[PDB]
Amino acid sequence: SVHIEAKQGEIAESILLPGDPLRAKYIAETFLEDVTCYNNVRGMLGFTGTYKGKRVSVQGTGMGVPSISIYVNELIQSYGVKNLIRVGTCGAIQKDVKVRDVIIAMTACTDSNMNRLTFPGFDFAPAANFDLLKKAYDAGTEKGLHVRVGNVLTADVFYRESMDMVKKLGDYGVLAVEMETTALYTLAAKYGVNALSVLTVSDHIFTGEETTSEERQTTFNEMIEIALDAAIQ
Amino acid sequence: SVHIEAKQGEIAESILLPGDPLRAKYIAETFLEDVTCYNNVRGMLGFTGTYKGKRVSVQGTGMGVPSISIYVNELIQSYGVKNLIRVGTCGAIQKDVKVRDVIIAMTACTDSNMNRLTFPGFDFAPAANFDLLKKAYDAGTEKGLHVRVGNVLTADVFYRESMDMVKKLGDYGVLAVEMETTALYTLAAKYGVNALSVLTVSDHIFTGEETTSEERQTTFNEMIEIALDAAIQ
Amino acid sequence: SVHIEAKQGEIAESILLPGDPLRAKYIAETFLEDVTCYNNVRGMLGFTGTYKGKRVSVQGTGMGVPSISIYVNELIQSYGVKNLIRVGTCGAIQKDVKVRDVIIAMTACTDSNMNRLTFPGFDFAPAANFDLLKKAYDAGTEKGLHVRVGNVLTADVFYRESMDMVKKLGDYGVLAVEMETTALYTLAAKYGVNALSVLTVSDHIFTGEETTSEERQTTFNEMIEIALDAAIQ
Amino acid sequence: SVHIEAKQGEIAESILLPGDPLRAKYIAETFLEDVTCYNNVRGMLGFTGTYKGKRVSVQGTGMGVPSISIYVNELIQSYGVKNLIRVGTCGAIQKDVKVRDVIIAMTACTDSNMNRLTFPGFDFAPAANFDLLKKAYDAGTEKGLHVRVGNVLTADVFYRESMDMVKKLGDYGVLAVEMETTALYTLAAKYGVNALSVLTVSDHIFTGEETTSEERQTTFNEMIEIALDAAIQ
Amino acid sequence: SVHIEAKQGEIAESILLPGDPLRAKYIAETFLEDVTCYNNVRGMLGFTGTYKGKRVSVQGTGMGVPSISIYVNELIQSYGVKNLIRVGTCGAIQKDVKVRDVIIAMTACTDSNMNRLTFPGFDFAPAANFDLLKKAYDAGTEKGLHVRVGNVLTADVFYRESMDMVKKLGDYGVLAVEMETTALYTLAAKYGVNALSVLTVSDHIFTGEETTSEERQTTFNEMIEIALDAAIQ
Amino acid sequence: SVHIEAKQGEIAESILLPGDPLRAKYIAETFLEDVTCYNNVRGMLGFTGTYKGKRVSVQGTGMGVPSISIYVNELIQSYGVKNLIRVGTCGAIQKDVKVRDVIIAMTACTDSNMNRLTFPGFDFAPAANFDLLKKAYDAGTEKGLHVRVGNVLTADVFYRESMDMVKKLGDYGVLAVEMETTALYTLAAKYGVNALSVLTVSDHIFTGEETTSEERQTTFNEMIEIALDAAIQ
Ligand SMILES: Nc1ncnc2c1ncn2[C@@H]1O[C@H](CO)[C@@H](O)[C@H]1O
Ligand SMILES: Nc1ncnc2c1ncn2[C@@H]1O[C@H](CO)[C@@H](O)[C@H]1O
Ligand SMILES: Nc1ncnc2c1ncn2[C@@H]1O[C@H](CO)[C@@H](O)[C@H]1O
Ligand SMILES: Nc1ncnc2c1ncn2[C@@H]1O[C@H](CO)[C@@H](O)[C@H]1O
Ligand SMILES: Nc1ncnc2c1ncn2[C@@H]1O[C@H](CO)[C@@H](O)[C@H]1O
Ligand SMILES: Nc1ncnc2c1ncn2[C@@H]1O[C@H](CO)[C@@H](O)[C@H]1O
């Protein structure tokens, strides 16, 4: 496809979608066997391998609705991908949500215009595939993770002049901010395929708490495992 | 409160919210014991009774975001209600959704402006309380119902000059149209309480299929049972 | 129709539209002769009777644009109703508007999206039928009522986190808040029929002044009389 | 003021507001005595004179919301003007509205953003002053004119790539298109003063019928007379 | 055309577009030879003459997007005009922009809805014709003027209840406020013709600094010269 | 900064901003001397080197407004970057714009909501820094490139269900589609720094014409040279 140089059939029907292509590489190296790298266009690494005997892929998406939308469109339309699980990070809005929690997004709010353009006059609420959601939730619960299922904000702007609205969203139960889910969920719905976002809380927007990769790496691995565990079902 | 003449403490912390006050009466009469009617302001009947030993209420909401918003605000703010389960009907958008299916709304799309006014520039995705959702889903699954968990449209207009957008939403996986969930979910989130909408598909918008109360009454009863079963947990 | 169980011809061409179905019952019992109740679907009572020799109906609408829109659409499209006069209550915004004043809405502002969806990019100003307006105004003037003809706000939300905009509207001459007129006026215009809203100021939003039915019942009756007097012309 | 070079007190409290400054000149010359021209800034002629013994002014506004808004703001804020009657032309949308009809605008729809900016999330319906409206209506009725009281469209664009929405508005009873009323009515309301627009139908948008000044001059004069007759009351 | 009484061929292909028709007259009298006045409809004077041997016209536009849109549409569509240079005034937003500076608008921001209506969901950035822009810039530079090339605000409202947004725009580099450029640039682009706005800073919005015609007349003349110098190329 | 691991001072004040980090690497390797790679967070390579004796950096941005906004914010706020030149690709909308043309964006249209959120009610037109624009234009002209200065569309969605609006924008002179400029220009303006986008037309949206890196590599190099030539001034 335009942004993915894979040959037909090289991408598995189940795919994990980290924002960071280097995390795709990490996931492939850490969890998968019989790995090949099928894409390095724009450095947006994608890999296919085998996990517990099942083929799976992992494809970076970049950050933001427009970037992930490119990849998701191509994966679905050009590569026949059926199950797409974003494995990402997010920033907690509320004190009640803690760093290293895993958030499974039921739905996402957004400041993107993408859905307003598609559905003028409507608020489109992008919805996770419940099957996948339940699988991931059950896997996370069994794995002993702190799993929160709820609402997230898919933001176009990481750096907002005022966080007032973000705070307000937090007061309405929105758990965390991230930059992809609206697009993933909307496009998956458009094409009748199955999507989920499983997120690790990496930072707390208002408390300032931040983490490096390694500082959330055990939790991150466990999260990847549940995203993979859900995927291979 | 302005629209509910109940004394403090007369409304249980768990409440079912049919749109039709006559369905509130039906639910109270059919399922509850030790029933009292605490409201007949505007004919919007509300009852409190006991179900399998647990106090529960049932309160009509009327149709539409503005009507249910009145009642939900009052129930939450004036009567301390904590668990609110709309038990309603809806119109299927897709052929894949069948009359008498039970839909548990994860989230809701809307053509209402209510959330645009609250969150200018954002698409707010109103989210069910996952705990309640899971309880209802599990109860429905155990009850042997066809339960679909997914997205719905909360419509301001029942009678639309064109159903093109509704169809488009259906193509994006939106299961059914109804007229309350956005408000319920948004307000419950605002106030940190727990909401869910459990819906019986009563009609199919495009196929023209329609049902009367009795024609979906067995399924309706089973749905009420799961809404009550979820509530009493 | 879907929400009205009347047989064809049971609903008169002129109809009063209180929000409260119990007020429909009151109006029928108090003012009409040869009354029959043609609807009790959803408790949304509707009656037809005779007033000073002329057949007239009275139909509750429920609260909010979506609710009244259902009934008005059905009345117009399915029952051939030609003259629709909402007889309602409203909350004064300004000190200059007093409890028990009668407001005849020339037009209505709204926070509803209903007209934005119909007329993207436009502000649609829903307009009363001037003939009816003048009749009601003249009748009210002759009846010795305080009648104010002006602008109202048709609100989707009764319970607003901030009344700043409502206050601002008041500063622009908007007299009172209510929850139906935009829809009535817009739909009547759509279908080329005649609508008016005649409102009793029942409360003052900022002063906190409130009234019960009986506390405005003499004025309310006189208002009903002018709505009927206008209707039978 | 910035756009009006009149000294304080030179502008009467009642003013007619044609869009065309040359029509202001015509009105002053034709109807007024003891006339002085108080403004020729930007050629936007303004005059004050006496009509049937009462001082009155006439001030061109130019075309469009932004132009009239300038003048109306200045007239109200800087010159203490209290009664403002636009005397304009308009283009009929419907066949039912005929060239040379006089339209008294109750309210106005618009494609302007002016009110969306002032009242985010709301549709503001600009309303005529009913007193003035009634006076003009009664005067027009007594004068034997075809007077239509209703809704108009205040357009920002005279030349629209598609008239579909304009047609749709016509189907919702909007009588005619013009380019000032929203602003006049909104600003008058803002400042607690009295406004009305009295319009002569000069063209029919869809039929192509057009008129020159002289071809509607007798009707135009009669309209000016009612705007003056209303003003001097 | 509807608003211009010129015969075909009387308007030159290059035209200057002051907002003030009296400035059109000034420009024609001061700079042009062999002048005729081709329009006095609505007092909106238009002239054609010769400048340094080249035919050029000058046409008032009135103030605001709707007014200039009328004239520009007619000039382009009915009179075959190809190069349109607004020669106007503007109010500085920033201290960094000084009275008597000449601003050449690259683009314009707006609070008008005109482009939202044309391009729903999009922000249309109206762009100057670069050729013309460069010509004017080079001419202004050679003339020894302070020329600023940048962004302007095309405002619908001259009199804003709050200048907060205007200030904010100034913080984003918007140089000055005026009331026409969006329309000129958008329409010129629509029709594939060439437009530019060259503005004299006549006032400073926040400092209160104001100028009369004569107080900026030397600079104004030089600006007209560059608009003419650009035009005749 | 959060997404750039550079130490303070490692990033030059002038920076080129390709969307593709691999193009950053190409630019650094091909044009710069004394190169160091200061960032590989998320694979979003950034380099600093020397070009014709002047320090310059090159930093990938990723695709889309949200991605570039992250990097631009960080570059400006955390690294004191002053001159930012996006060097990108774009898709021609019109036949009149040819593959391998270089487009210098004066401004950008967008379907992003980013500016609507910042400037509610306004259309913000993001503007290039004219100085930089002129430098790049002059350099491109001297280099013998086909340089087009004009308007572009900054799209959030690469894959649009309908290109109707894109076509319409093309009819209004918008030259090409890309996915970053609005953000770059807006943020640069916000922070008072200098931005430009210089684009190579790599594809034609409607004709289907596409190019690989090498197929536009000579032109691409020349474009990079002008972006560098402009930068080092
Ligand atoms: N606080 C945050 N705000 C926005 N996005 C975040 C945040 N924390 C993590 N992310 C995620 O990481 C990237 C932004 O750093 C995006 O892909 C986004 O999903
Ligand atoms: N087809 C439908 N469209 C909208 N609302 C529906 C539909 N079917 C059932 N409903 C529900 O019933 C009422 C409208 O008849 C509302 O309360 C709504 O939730
Ligand atoms: N203050 C108020 N705000 C909104 N609606 C009101 C108010 N007072 C009376 N109403 C009317 O009564 C109902 C809400 O109580 C609605 O039908 C509405 O029209
Ligand atoms: N068909 C029309 N469309 C828009 N404005 C019109 C029309 N006919 C008359 N007008 C009025 O005349 C001017 C435009 O020609 C405006 O002031 C407007 O109010
Ligand atoms: N401060 C200002 N605000 C708006 N428009 C201005 C300003 N200064 C000059 N103008 C220009 O002059 C007219 C408004 O006085 C408009 O045509 C506009 O372009
Ligand atoms: N046809 C196109 N549509 C959108 N973006 C494009 C196109 N061609 C090139 N681009 C650019 O390349 C990336 C998308 O492939 C974005 O960074 C964008 O700026």
Coordinates of N, CA, C and O in Angstrom, one line a residue, chain B residues 93-173:
Chain B
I93 N -31.2 -0.5 13.1 CA -30.7 0.1 11.9 C -30.4 -0.9 10.8 O -30.7 -0.8 9.7
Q94 N -29.7 -1.9 11.3 CA -29.1 -3.0 10.4 C -30.0 -4.2 10.4 O -30.8 -4.5 11.3
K95 N -29.9 -4.9 9.3 CA -30.6 -6.2 9.1 C -30.1 -7.2 10.1 O -30.7 -8.1 10.6
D96 N -28.8 -7.0 10.5 CA -28.1 -7.9 11.4 C -28.6 -7.9 12.8 O -28.4 -8.8 13.6
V97 N -29.4 -6.8 13.1 CA -30.0 -6.7 14.4 C -31.5 -7.0 14.3 O -32.2 -6.4 13.5
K98 N -31.9 -7.9 15.1 CA -33.3 -8.4 15.0 C -34.2 -8.0 16.0 O -33.8 -7.7 17.2
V99 N -35.5 -7.8 15.7 CA -36.5 -7.5 16.6 C -36.4 -8.5 17.7 O -36.2 -9.7 17.5
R100 N -36.6 -8.0 18.9 CA -36.5 -8.7 20.2 C -35.1 -9.0 20.7 O -34.9 -9.5 21.7
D101 N -34.1 -8.6 19.9 CA -32.8 -8.6 20.4 C -32.7 -7.6 21.6 O -33.5 -6.7 21.6
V102 N -31.8 -7.9 22.5 CA -31.6 -7.0 23.6 C -30.2 -6.3 23.3 O -29.2 -7.0 23.1
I103 N -30.2 -5.0 23.3 CA -29.0 -4.3 23.0 C -28.6 -3.6 24.3 O -29.4 -2.9 24.9
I104 N -27.4 -3.8 24.7 CA -26.8 -3.1 25.8 C -25.9 -2.1 25.2 O -24.9 -2.4 24.5
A105 N -26.2 -0.8 25.5 CA -25.4 0.2 24.9 C -24.1 0.5 25.6 O -24.1 0.9 26.7
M106 N -23.0 0.2 24.9 CA -21.7 0.6 25.4 C -21.6 2.1 25.4 O -21.0 2.7 26.4
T107 N -22.1 2.7 24.4 CA -21.9 4.2 24.1 C -23.1 4.5 23.2 O -23.9 3.7 22.8
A108 N -23.2 5.8 22.9 CA -24.2 6.3 22.1 C -23.7 7.5 21.3 O -23.0 8.3 21.8
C109 N -24.1 7.5 20.0 CA -23.9 8.6 19.1 C -25.2 9.5 19.3 O -26.2 9.0 19.9
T110 N -25.1 10.7 18.8 CA -26.3 11.5 18.9 C -26.3 12.6 17.9 O -25.3 13.1 17.5
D111 N -27.5 13.1 17.6 CA -27.7 14.3 16.9 C -28.1 15.5 17.9 O -28.3 16.6 17.4
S112 N -28.1 15.2 19.2 CA -28.3 16.2 20.1 C -27.2 17.1 20.2 O -26.0 16.7 20.0
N113 N -27.4 18.4 20.6 CA -26.4 19.3 20.9 C -25.9 19.3 22.3 O -25.1 20.1 22.7
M114 N -26.5 18.4 23.2 CA -26.3 18.6 24.6 C -24.8 18.6 25.0 O -24.4 19.4 25.8
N115 N -24.1 17.7 24.4 CA -22.7 17.6 24.7 C -21.8 18.6 24.0 O -20.7 19.0 24.5
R116 N -22.2 19.0 22.8 CA -21.4 20.0 22.2 C -21.5 21.3 23.0 O -20.5 22.1 23.0
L117 N -22.6 21.5 23.6 CA -22.7 22.7 24.4 C -21.8 22.7 25.7 O -21.2 23.7 26.1
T118 N -21.7 21.5 26.2 CA -20.9 21.2 27.4 C -19.4 21.2 27.1 O -18.6 21.6 27.9
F119 N -19.1 20.6 25.9 CA -17.7 20.4 25.6 C -17.4 21.0 24.2 O -17.2 20.2 23.2
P120 N -17.5 22.3 24.1 CA -17.3 22.9 22.8 C -16.0 22.4 22.1 O -15.0 22.3 22.7
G121 N -16.2 22.0 20.8 CA -15.1 21.6 20.0 C -14.8 20.1 20.1 O -14.0 19.6 19.4
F122 N -15.4 19.4 21.1 CA -15.2 18.0 21.3 C -16.4 17.2 21.0 O -17.6 17.6 21.1
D123 N -16.1 15.9 20.6 CA -17.1 14.9 20.5 C -17.0 14.1 21.8 O -16.0 13.5 22.1
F124 N -18.0 14.2 22.6 CA -18.1 13.5 23.9 C -18.7 12.2 23.6 O -19.8 12.1 23.0
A125 N -18.1 11.1 23.9 CA -18.6 9.8 23.8 C -19.1 9.3 25.1 O -18.4 9.0 26.0
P126 N -20.5 9.3 25.3 CA -21.0 8.9 26.6 C -20.8 7.4 26.8 O -21.1 6.7 25.8
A127 N -20.3 7.0 27.9 CA -20.0 5.6 28.1 C -20.8 5.0 29.2 O -21.0 5.6 30.3
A128 N -21.2 3.7 29.0 CA -21.8 3.0 30.0 C -20.9 2.7 31.2 O -19.7 2.6 31.0
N129 N -21.4 2.5 32.4 CA -20.6 2.0 33.4 C -20.3 0.5 33.1 O -21.2 -0.3 32.9
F130 N -19.0 0.2 33.0 CA -18.6 -1.1 32.5 C -19.1 -2.2 33.5 O -19.5 -3.3 33.1
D131 N -19.0 -2.0 34.8 CA -19.4 -2.9 35.8 C -20.9 -3.3 35.5 O -21.2 -4.5 35.3
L132 N -21.7 -2.3 35.4 CA -23.1 -2.6 35.2 C -23.3 -3.3 33.9 O -24.1 -4.2 33.7
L133 N -22.6 -2.8 32.9 CA -22.7 -3.4 31.5 C -22.4 -4.9 31.6 O -23.1 -5.7 31.1
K134 N -21.3 -5.2 32.3 CA -20.8 -6.6 32.3 C -21.9 -7.4 33.1 O -22.2 -8.6 32.7
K135 N -22.4 -6.9 34.2 CA -23.4 -7.6 34.9 C -24.6 -7.9 34.1 O -25.1 -9.1 34.0
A136 N -25.1 -6.9 33.4 CA -26.3 -7.1 32.5 C -26.0 -8.1 31.4 O -26.8 -8.9 31.1
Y137 N -24.8 -7.9 30.8 CA -24.4 -8.8 29.7 C -24.3 -10.3 30.2 O -24.9 -11.2 29.6
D138 N -23.7 -10.5 31.4 CA -23.6 -11.8 31.9 C -25.0 -12.3 32.2 O -25.3 -13.5 32.0
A139 N -25.8 -11.5 32.8 CA -27.2 -11.9 33.2 C -28.0 -12.3 31.9 O -28.7 -13.3 31.9
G140 N -27.9 -11.5 30.9 CA -28.6 -11.7 29.7 C -28.1 -13.0 29.0 O -28.9 -13.7 28.4
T141 N -26.8 -13.2 29.0 CA -26.2 -14.4 28.4 C -26.7 -15.6 29.2 O -27.2 -16.5 28.5
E142 N -26.8 -15.5 30.5 CA -27.2 -16.7 31.3 C -28.7 -16.9 31.1 O -29.2 -18.0 31.1
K143 N -29.5 -15.8 30.8 CA -30.9 -15.9 30.6 C -31.3 -16.5 29.3 O -32.4 -16.8 29.0
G144 N -30.3 -16.6 28.4 CA -30.5 -17.1 27.1 C -31.0 -16.2 26.1 O -31.7 -16.5 25.1
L145 N -30.8 -14.9 26.3 CA -31.3 -13.8 25.4 C -30.2 -13.6 24.3 O -29.1 -13.9 24.5
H146 N -30.7 -13.1 23.2 CA -29.8 -12.5 22.2 C -29.4 -11.2 22.7 O -30.2 -10.2 22.6
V147 N -28.2 -11.0 23.2 CA -27.7 -9.8 23.7 C -26.6 -9.3 22.8 O -25.7 -10.0 22.4
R148 N -26.8 -8.0 22.4 CA -25.8 -7.4 21.5 C -25.3 -6.2 22.3 O -26.0 -5.4 22.8
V149 N -24.0 -6.1 22.5 CA -23.4 -5.0 23.2 C -22.7 -4.1 22.1 O -21.9 -4.6 21.3
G150 N -23.1 -2.9 22.0 CA -22.6 -2.0 21.0 C -23.1 -0.6 21.1 O -23.5 -0.1 22.2
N151 N -23.0 0.0 20.0 CA -23.3 1.4 19.8 C -24.7 1.7 19.4 O -25.3 0.9 18.7
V152 N -25.3 2.8 19.9 CA -26.6 3.1 19.5 C -26.6 4.6 19.1 O -25.7 5.3 19.4
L153 N -27.7 5.0 18.5 CA -27.9 6.4 18.2 C -29.0 6.9 19.1 O -30.1 6.4 19.1
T154 N -28.7 7.9 19.9 CA -29.6 8.7 20.6 C -30.1 9.8 19.8 O -29.3 10.8 19.5
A155 N -31.3 9.7 19.3 CA -31.8 10.7 18.3 C -32.7 11.7 19.0 O -33.5 11.4 19.9
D156 N -32.6 13.0 18.6 CA -33.6 14.0 18.9 C -34.8 13.9 18.1 O -35.9 14.3 18.5
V157 N -34.6 13.4 16.8 CA -35.8 13.4 16.0 C -36.1 12.0 15.6 O -35.3 11.3 15.0
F158 N -37.3 11.6 16.0 CA -37.9 10.3 15.6 C -38.2 10.3 14.2 O -37.9 9.3 13.5
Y159 N -38.7 11.4 13.7 CA -39.2 11.6 12.3 C -38.3 12.5 11.5 O -38.4 13.7 11.4
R160 N -37.3 11.8 10.8 CA -36.2 12.5 10.1 C -36.6 12.5 8.6 O -37.1 11.5 8.0
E161 N -36.4 13.7 7.9 CA -36.8 13.8 6.5 C -36.0 12.9 5.7 O -36.4 12.4 4.7
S162 N -34.8 12.6 6.1 CA -34.0 11.6 5.4 C -33.3 10.7 6.5 O -32.8 11.2 7.4
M163 N -33.3 9.4 6.2 CA -32.6 8.5 7.1 C -31.2 8.2 6.6 O -30.6 7.3 7.1
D164 N -30.7 9.0 5.7 CA -29.3 8.7 5.1 C -28.3 8.6 6.2 O -27.4 7.7 6.1
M165 N -28.3 9.5 7.1 CA -27.2 9.5 8.1 C -27.4 8.3 9.0 O -26.5 7.7 9.5
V166 N -28.7 8.0 9.4 CA -29.0 6.9 10.2 C -28.4 5.7 9.6 O -27.8 4.8 10.2
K167 N -28.7 5.5 8.3 CA -28.1 4.4 7.5 C -26.6 4.4 7.6 O -26.0 3.3 7.7
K168 N -26.0 5.5 7.4 CA -24.6 5.6 7.4 C -24.1 5.2 8.8 O -23.1 4.4 8.9
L169 N -24.7 5.6 9.9 CA -24.3 5.2 11.2 C -24.4 3.7 11.3 O -23.6 3.1 11.9
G170 N -25.5 3.1 10.7 CA -25.6 1.7 10.7 C -24.5 1.0 10.0 O -24.0 -0.1 10.4
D171 N -23.9 1.6 9.0 CA -22.8 1.1 8.3 C -21.5 1.2 9.1 O -20.5 0.5 8.8
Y172 N -21.6 2.0 10.1 CA -20.5 2.1 11.1 C -20.8 1.4 12.3 O -20.2 1.7 13.4
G173 N -21.7 0.4 12.3 CA -21.9 -0.5 13.3 C -22.9 -0.1 14.4 O -23.1 -0.8 15.3

